[PDB]
Amino acid sequence: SRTEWRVRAISSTNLHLRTQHIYVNSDDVKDTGYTYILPKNILKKFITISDLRTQIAGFMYGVSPPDNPQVKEIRCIVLVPQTGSHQQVNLPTQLPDHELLRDFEPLGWMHTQPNELPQLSPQDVTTHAKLLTDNISWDGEKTVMITCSFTPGSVSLTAYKLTPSGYEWGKANTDKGNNPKGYMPTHYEKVQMLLSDRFLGYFMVPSNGVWNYNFQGQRWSPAMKFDVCLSNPKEYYHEDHRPVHF
Numbered sequence: 001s002r003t004e005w006r007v008r009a010i011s012s013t014n015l016h017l018r019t020q021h022i023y024v025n026s027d028d029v030k031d032t033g034y035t036y037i038l039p040k041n042i043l044k045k046f047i048t049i050s051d052l053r054t055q056i057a058g059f060m061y062g063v064s065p066p067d068n069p070q071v072k073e074i075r076c077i078v079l080v081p082q083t084g085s086h087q088q089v090n091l092p093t094q095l096p097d098h099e100l101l102r103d104f105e106p107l108g109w110m111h112t113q114p115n116e117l118p119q120l121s122p123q124d125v126t127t128h129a130k131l132l133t134d135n136i137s138w139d140g141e142k143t144v145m146i147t148c149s150f151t152p153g154s155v156s157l158t159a160y161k162l163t164p165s166g167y168e169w170g171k172a173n174t175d176k177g178n179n180p181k182g183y184m185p186t187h188y189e190k191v192q193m194l195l196s197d198r199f200l201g202y203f204m205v206p207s208n209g210v211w212n213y214n215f216q217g218q219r220w221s222p223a224m225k226f227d228v229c230l231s232n233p234k235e236y237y238h239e240d241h242r243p244v245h246f
Contacts, residue, residue: 002246009237012051019044021154024195034142035192036107036159037073042201043148043157046077050112051236052150054214055084057111058203059096060146061104072107072142076100078204079211079233083220086114088123088176090220095135096228098204106135108143116149120160120188122173122180128162129170140167144191159193204228212236215243 022043050056058077065071078096082089089111109131113121124145132138140162149156162170166187173180205211207227211234213220234240 005237005242005246009235012235012237015048015050015052016044018150018153018155019047022195023151023154023156024193025156025158025190026192027190029190029192033161033191034070034072035194036144036146037071037194037196037198038110038146038157039074039199039201040195040197042074042077042203043195045203045233046110047112047148047155049233049235050148051214053086053114054236055086055089055112055114056212056236057082057084057089057091057109059109060107061101062107063105072105073199074107075199075201076104076204077110077201078228079206080228081206081211081213081220081224081226083213083217087121087178088127090222091127092224092226093134093222094225095137096204096226098228100230101204101228106137106139106143108138108145110146110148113147113149116151116156117147119185120145120147122178122183123176124160125162125166125170125183125187126173126176126180129167129173132162132167133171140164146193157193157195159191160188161191163187163189203231203233205231205233209234210240212238212241215241 058079060074061076062074146159207229
């Protein structure tokens with residue numbers, strides 16, 4: 001329905017309201033490790049181009065502040081060609097590559113999620129374990145996952161790191177559902193994160209100007225190759241994201 005598309009596009013412009021009420025779960029995090037600083041400007045933009053029901057994601061890149069070795073500041077988010085569901089996001093096996101990105105530290109990924117969950121999803125652990133094993137540039141000691149859970153009238157953020165055992169389990173997991181065998185809360189660990197407007201972050205999207213393939217699944221595949229470039233991300237229901245035909 002072309003009309004429905006226009007209606008959804010309209011209601012989605014109210015997503016920014018949720019970024020007025022942001023919550024960060026820093027509850028009982030180990031005092032050992034890194035603290036992640038996410039810029040408010042990119043978290044807000046990330047929410048405005050997202051969707052309440054279908055998850056989206058982006059890879060995070062950042063730097064190490066000269067005066068605090070235990071702090072990692074996220075300065076760039078890369079949106080890759082993708083499709084997703086209420087339970088997960090589907091990303092190409094090929095990591096983004098660009099001269100501008102090579103001098104940053106890969107810090108993991110972030111993604112939206114329909115509801116707040118009592119535990120990190122088994123899917124997230126599996127997706128993260130895959131990203132680690134395949135990419136030598138991904139340091140398990142610094143890469144993390146930030147979940148942006150939509151809660152009534154707001155968004156709730158949490159950052160996690162995989163535990164050595166979680167990495168092992170994730171690398172072997174074969175059932176995408178919500179209760180895989182051997183899944184324990186000891187497979188991941190919460191990490192400290194801050195949402196700050198002290199500095200700004202930037203976005204990089206696919207060079208063809210299309211990151212959202214949720215209405216063009218036939219053009220998406222795990223093996224697809226792509227390039228990226230600096231740019232302001234297009235919303236979920238942007239003109240260029242609609243199906244080749246209704």
